[model samples]
Target: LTQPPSVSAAPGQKVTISCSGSSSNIGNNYVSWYQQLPGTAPKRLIYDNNKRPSGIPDRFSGSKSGTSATLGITGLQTGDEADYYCGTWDSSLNPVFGGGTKLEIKRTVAAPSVFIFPPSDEQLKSGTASVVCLLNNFYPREAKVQWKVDNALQSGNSQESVTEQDSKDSTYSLSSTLTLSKADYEKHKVYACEVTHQGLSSPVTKSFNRGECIDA
Candidate 1:
């Protein structure tokens, strides 16, 4: 099976993703389409070429003619961003799925909200304090997180979580944590989390100075 690697359109615009196969696959068998969001199981959108599963909106549709099948989405929403796949059974009865297509929103901003959290008292007493940096609601998914003490960059061992896409807004989020020993934490006057993203003109930095929080 064959499909475009990616497609993009403006909000409320109409878009169609196509899948093509030879006589043994899409041409003779029923075609099904699946929608996959980050960190979640894929859900079937269209089955038997053009049938919608219960609860799926009518704006999403599918069709087939000759050896090609098409998945059409009208009045698209940002929440509709996802990866789509088309599947069918070949003449040999082997299952086949097309190369996935990523649907993206055009002209969308990639600015992400950044937050830093200091370790709790309980954590401080346990010999270590873990500071957290949360970056939420970004698009296009390229980001890097770094830690600093005072104004100097520190080496790694900072824990970074997997990035996730929000189910509602279709934006992305990620978290990074830095652990410091109780003595080291008390000796530092400032601790910072710096995030770099292609969308921003420069890196975003947030810091915790003693008991005060500062964002720059």
Candidate 2:
């Protein structure tokens, strides 16, 4: 297990973490990268290290040279930061994440851009409702989207979908949907959308109300 360096840098300085694997994670099938902020969960930064997630700025990226991998962050900003981790397949084919890097900002600004779906407070009495999970700006189709009710995992009734390229940005979108009764909503259980990509430090999740409509 070759380790990436833990980083601490002043604002406006470039930082890179090198993750060395015994074998080629890219050739073998799984490798992922993540970013985490203070007091919040980690977000997927690089899936297979080069592909960018939907709505993610291009400043963060992953690259590979032989058995070693590199995560690069450019134009570092006061708020352009967080702890970063790398995930990949081990000898046993199980996913693993790096220990993680600590990003220290000399100046503070708006928060980093990470997609999150918060639970809705609206009440659902009786009606037909649909729960949809959209993953925009994803590449290298190694992700699985799932729905959960009241913290229990629910089967996906509809097939997951991918949207056509917008052409303007040249990035595609992916989505999954689940339909449930009003009773399922009244339970006020948490409905979550989780994306599991190969070689990720961990899965990224967004959750919402059973009956709420979130404008993507």
Top candidate when judged by TM-score against the true structure: 1
In candidate 1, what are the lDDT values of residues 1-216, reduced to their tens digit? 999999888778999999989988888899999999865688999998999999999999999999999999999886887899999999998889999998887647778789999888777778998889998888767788889988878777588875544556767888898878989898888889999987779999998787664333
For candidate 2, write residues 67-180 as lDDT tens digits.
777788876764545667878887677887667766544332211112434323332233645666777664333467767767787774646776432333323467676766
Strongest candidate by lDDT? 1
Q: Report lDDT per candidate.
A: 0.86, 0.62
Candidate 2 similarity to native, TM-score = 0.45
CA shift of 139, model 2, Å: 39
lDDT of 1: 0.86
CA lDDT, candidate 2, residue 8: 50
- Per-candidate total of colliding backbone pairs: 0, 3
Worst 10 residues of 1 by lDDT: 162-171
